[PDB]
Design a protein around this motif. Structure first.
Motif, PDB file in Angstrom:
ATOM      1  N   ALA A 256       0.823  -1.204   0.000  1.00 30.62           N
ATOM      2  CA  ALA A 256       0.000   0.000   0.000  1.00 30.62           C
ATOM      3  C   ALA A 256       0.863   1.262   0.000  1.00 30.62           C
ATOM      4  O   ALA A 256       0.478   2.277  -0.583  1.00 30.62           O
ATOM      5  CB  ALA A 256      -0.930  -0.004   1.213  1.00 30.62           C
ATOM      6  N   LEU A 259       2.006   2.151  -3.536  1.00 33.68           N
ATOM      7  CA  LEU A 259       0.974   2.644  -4.434  1.00 33.68           C
ATOM      8  C   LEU A 259       0.677   4.118  -4.243  1.00 33.68           C
ATOM      9  O   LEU A 259      -0.102   4.683  -5.014  1.00 33.68           O
ATOM     10  CB  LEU A 259      -0.335   1.883  -4.245  1.00 33.68           C
ATOM     11  N   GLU A 260       1.307   4.785  -3.321  1.00 34.20           N
ATOM     12  CA  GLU A 260       0.952   6.143  -3.085  1.00 34.20           C
ATOM     13  C   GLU A 260       1.171   6.927  -4.310  1.00 34.20           C
ATOM     14  O   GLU A 260       2.220   6.874  -4.857  1.00 34.20           O
ATOM     15  CB  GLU A 260       1.855   6.741  -2.048  1.00 34.20           C
TER      16      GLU A 260
HETATM   17 MG    MG Z   1      -1.915   3.568  -1.137  1.00 30.42          MG
END
Ligand code: MG
Ligand code: MG
Ligand code: MG
Ligand code: MG
Ligand code: MG
Ligand code: MG
Ligand code: MG
Ligand code: MG
Ligand code: MG
Ligand code: MG
Ligand code: MG
Ligand code: MG
Ligand code: MG
Ligand code: MG
Length: 290
Positions: A256, A259-260
């Protein structure tokens, strides 16, 4: 509106970078780290052998930024490369080029320290680039140089950015880069690796890169990618080809994190999905024929 002369000093350069950053949807720091990496890449591209062929090919996250551009790629701290000669030749040549400079930029390179990788006889090397512009310190870039493996320096692609052109430094950027079949083979091997007892594999971020790379391959034949994966897996002789793409327990939040900034892209949003996407890519590569 576009600048007619280069920036006269570092303040005027920072100031122009920030106006370009806001002008097109980026944080100042991402754009600055990107300019620093472009500059370092231009120093690496002056290293030629006696035929003019590059001695350093860019790989890893820096290659992907160049390929896709800043908005559609992961932030890359590292500047990794593959050399076709010994580092001692590589490190002396960069300090030389760093001293001559490039369009106002100068660089100083700390000393290479070997690092430990257990699948390669020749050990990789890390050092740092201390950039300056018209004398004044500008930024600090980690560098990773590693040895050729099989045919991963046999060809290159040549990528460009116009970032420096936006701030009125007009000179063309043209960076030799490792090709995609070999970027895929190296990230596939790293993401499926099982490490020694002190450390664990943190490379969930490579599952993002591998999804980006599969898109860039488009509908090309995968035979070159399969051959490259076979070759990297045999040469390193750790786990065998075809690998199982295993998720580790801390990876959901690392993934996660990788994916920023990429909401706009079509990527798996969870790590489990990402792993599956990468496993189907593995199965596709393995089935490739003639
Ligand atoms: Mg993210
Ligand atoms: Mg100044
Ligand atoms: Mg800004
Ligand atoms: Mg501007
Ligand atoms: Mg040599
Ligand atoms: Mg160092
Ligand atoms: Mg080969
Ligand atoms: Mg070529
Ligand atoms: Mg890798
Ligand atoms: Mg094929
Ligand atoms: Mg082939
Ligand atoms: Mg198993
Ligand atoms: Mg999430
Ligand atoms: Mg596929």
């Amino acid at each position: 509106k576009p600048y007619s002369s280069p920036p006269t000093n570092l303040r005027s350069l920072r100031d122009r970078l920030t106006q370009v950053a806001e002008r097109q949807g980026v944080v100042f720091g991402r754009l600055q780290r990107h300019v620093a990496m472009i500059v370092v890449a231009q120093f690496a591209a002056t290293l030629t052998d006696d035929t003019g062929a590059p001695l350093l090919l860019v790989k890893g996250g820096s290659s992907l930024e160049l390929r896709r551009g800043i908005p559609d790629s992961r932030t890359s701290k590292d500047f990794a490369t593959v050399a076709r000669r010994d580092i001692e030749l590589i490190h002396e040549q960069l300090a030389d080029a760093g001293e001559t400079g490039w369009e106002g930029f100068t660089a100083i390179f700390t000393a290479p320290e070997e690092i430990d990788v257990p699948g390669m006889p020749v050990k990789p090397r890390r050092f740092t680039a201390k950039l300056s512009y018209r004398g004044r310190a500008f930024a600090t870039v980690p560098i990773e140089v590693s040895s050729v493996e099989a045919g991963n320096a046999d060809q290159f692609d040549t990528l460009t950015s116009d970032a420096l052109g936006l701030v009125g430094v007009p000179a063309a950027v043209a960076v030799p880069c490792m090709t995609i079949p070999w970027q895929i083979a190296q990230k596939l091997h790293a993401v499926t690796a099982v490490l020694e007892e002190p450390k664990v594999n943190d490379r969930a971020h490579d599952l993002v890169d591998l999804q980006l790379l599969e898109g860039l391959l488009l509908d090309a034949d995968l035979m070159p990618t399969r051959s490259a994966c076979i070759a990297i897996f045999e040469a390193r002789a750790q786990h065998p080809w075809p690998p199982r793409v295993a998720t580790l327990p801390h990876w959901p939040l690392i993934y996660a994190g990788a994916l920023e900034g990429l909401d706009h892209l079509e990527l798996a949003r969870t790590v489990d999905a990402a792993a599956q996407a990468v496993q189907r890519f593995v199965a596709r590569i393995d089935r490739a024929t003639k």
